[PDB]
Design a protein around this motif. Structure first.
Motif, mmCIF file in Angstrom:
data_model
loop_
_atom_site.group_PDB
_atom_site.id
_atom_site.type_symbol
_atom_site.label_atom_id
_atom_site.label_comp_id
_atom_site.label_asym_id
_atom_site.label_seq_id
_atom_site.Cartn_x
_atom_site.Cartn_y
_atom_site.Cartn_z
ATOM 1 N N UNK A 69 2.995 2.101 -2.437
ATOM 2 C CA UNK A 69 1.728 2.620 -2.969
ATOM 3 C C UNK A 69 1.858 3.211 -4.363
ATOM 4 N N UNK A 70 0.725 3.595 -4.947
ATOM 5 C CA UNK A 70 0.700 4.205 -6.269
ATOM 6 C C UNK A 70 -0.516 5.114 -6.356
ATOM 7 N N UNK A 71 -0.429 6.104 -7.242
ATOM 8 C CA UNK A 71 -1.474 7.103 -7.403
ATOM 9 C C UNK A 71 -2.066 6.982 -8.802
ATOM 10 N N UNK B 236 -3.115 5.226 3.940
ATOM 11 C CA UNK B 236 -1.786 4.836 3.482
ATOM 12 C C UNK B 236 -1.728 4.777 1.961
ATOM 13 N N UNK B 237 -2.827 4.375 1.326
ATOM 14 C CA UNK B 237 -2.921 4.339 -0.133
ATOM 15 C C UNK B 237 -4.388 4.485 -0.507
ATOM 16 N N UNK B 238 -4.825 5.691 -0.876
ATOM 17 C CA UNK B 238 -6.249 5.892 -1.190
ATOM 18 C C UNK B 238 -6.723 5.138 -2.421
ATOM 19 N N UNK B 239 -5.818 4.664 -3.275
ATOM 20 C CA UNK B 239 -6.206 3.982 -4.502
ATOM 21 C C UNK B 239 -6.284 2.470 -4.355
ATOM 22 N N UNK B 240 -5.399 1.868 -3.563
ATOM 23 C CA UNK B 240 -5.404 0.432 -3.386
ATOM 24 C C UNK B 240 -4.597 -0.345 -4.399
ATOM 25 N N UNK B 241 -3.766 0.323 -5.193
ATOM 26 C CA UNK B 241 -2.907 -0.325 -6.179
ATOM 27 C C UNK B 241 -1.470 -0.184 -5.701
ATOM 28 N N UNK B 242 -0.778 -1.309 -5.562
ATOM 29 C CA UNK B 242 0.557 -1.347 -4.987
ATOM 30 C C UNK B 242 1.590 -1.723 -6.040
ATOM 31 N N UNK B 243 2.859 -1.610 -5.655
ATOM 32 C CA UNK B 243 3.984 -1.972 -6.515
ATOM 33 C C UNK B 243 4.570 -3.275 -5.983
ATOM 34 N N UNK B 244 4.089 -4.385 -6.528
ATOM 35 C CA UNK B 244 4.548 -5.701 -6.121
ATOM 36 C C UNK B 244 5.931 -6.001 -6.681
#
Length: 342
Positions: A59-61, A40-48
């Motif tokens: 998610x974010x890239x 779902x998100x290979x990086x693990x950094x989200x947009x809170x």
DNA sequence: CGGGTTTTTGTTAAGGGCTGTATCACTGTGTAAGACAGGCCAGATC
């Protein structure tokens, strides 16, 4: 001062105690999820982001030159000034403490689509051992920057670590480490005003002084009310660091620091005793060299917090403070609140 | 080294009764979420 209920979307399970919210231009970004990153998100950094009291993790890239940093449960976040953050230490999902140091930033932004640039930094010299629950700040002295790392917990040494107590932890040395972000070098300073290993403390940074607040000591199982001053100086030779103890401290661990207005901070959350929880707030005013820790009116806490046993949150950055409490398990394992101070 | 004599076993011409083992048709342990490709509406746009 005002509490509010916030509902979370479908991926609520990705929030665990010890996350780290980061803010880039009035945009809070989630980090430090549970388990390894999925497809779902290979990086693990989200947009809170929160719209009309509702949470939705997007998610974010990363850029074509980043480094896929692993999730960390207790890093030492720190602002820096283009604008960028620093990550050091923490517990990987495999229960391994990382010794590296990370630098997050923004590479390309358009239509609310942020592309990060995670750059790994190589630290040489008096490098700190892998820790967790420590703090790091940046000081400005004579047009120069310098990282001030202190505190933290770690496992037993590689020789004294036995499998019968494989998960035993102990406080680290009270040494003070200055980190030069340009060269990537560290330097160990031992000071006669520091004799107790401290962890889960609060750190307030200023032009050239950092202010240590509260914490916990495993060697004594005590919550000391301390107020330290560390005025780092950056001459043309070797940086000279001094310390000073100050009266009027606060006895709390795992608190949440924020910034309502300039030159004044607010403390909320934490723990007074083991079974006792800190329910009052604390105002921190600053000047040129003086400090003032005052008291404000306690918020209107609901029946959920007043009888809960544990809570965890982080500074959103723009005066607001995110907060979460556990719940039933089957169901919703965690409830989440927001608290504004302005 | 044998006759003569003794002791302690084999022995099936057939049934009664206790004990051990094969047989039969079945059972319980494999039991919650993540990846992904297609479809569809809000929307920046040249």
């Amino acid at each position: 001062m005002s509490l509010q209920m916030v509902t979370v979307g479908h991926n609520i399970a990705l929030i665990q105690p010890g996350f780290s919210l980061m803010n880039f231009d009035g945009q809070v970004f989630f980090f430090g999820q549970k388990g390894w990153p999925k497809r779902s998100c290979p990086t693990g950094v989200f947009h809170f982001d929160i719209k009309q009291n509702h949470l939705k993790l997007k998610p974010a890239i990363f850029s074509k030159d980043s480094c896929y940093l692993p999730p960390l449960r207790y890093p030492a976040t720190c602002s820096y000034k283009k604008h960028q953050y620093i990550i050091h230490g923490g517990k990987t999902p495999n229960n391994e403490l990382s010794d590296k140091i990370y630098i997050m930033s923004v590479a390309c932004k358009n239509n609310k689509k942020v592309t990060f640039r995670c750059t790994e930094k190589d630290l040489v010299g008096d490098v700190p051992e892998p820790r967790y629950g420590h703090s790091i700040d940046v000081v400005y002295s004579r047009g120069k920057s310098m990282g001030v790392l202190f505190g933290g917990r770690s496992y037993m040494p590689s020789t004294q670590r036995t499998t019968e107590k494989w998960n035993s932890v102990a406080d680290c040395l009270p040494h003070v480490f200055l980190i030069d972000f340009e060269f990537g070098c560290a330097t160990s300073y031992i000071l006669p005003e520091l004799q107790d290993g401290l962890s889960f403390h609060v750190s307030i940074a200023r032009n050239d002084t950092v202010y240590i607040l509260g914490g916990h000591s495993l060697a004594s199982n005590i919550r000391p009310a301390n107020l330290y001053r560390i005025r780092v100086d950056l001459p043309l030779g070797t940086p000279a660091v001094n310390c000073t103890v100050l009266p009027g401290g606060i006895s709390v661990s795992s608190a949440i620091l924020t910034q309502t207005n300039n030159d004044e901070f607010v403390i909320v959350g934490g723990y007074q005793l083991e079974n006792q929880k800190r329910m009052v707030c604390s105002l921190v005013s600053l000047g040129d060299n003086t400090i003032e820790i005052s008291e404000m009116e306690t918020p209107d806490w609901t029946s959920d917090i007043k009888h809960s046993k544990i809570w965890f949150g982080s500074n959103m950055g723009n005066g607001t403070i995110f907060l979460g409490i556990p719940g039933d398990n089957k169901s919703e394992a965690f409830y989440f609140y927001t608290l504004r101070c302005s």
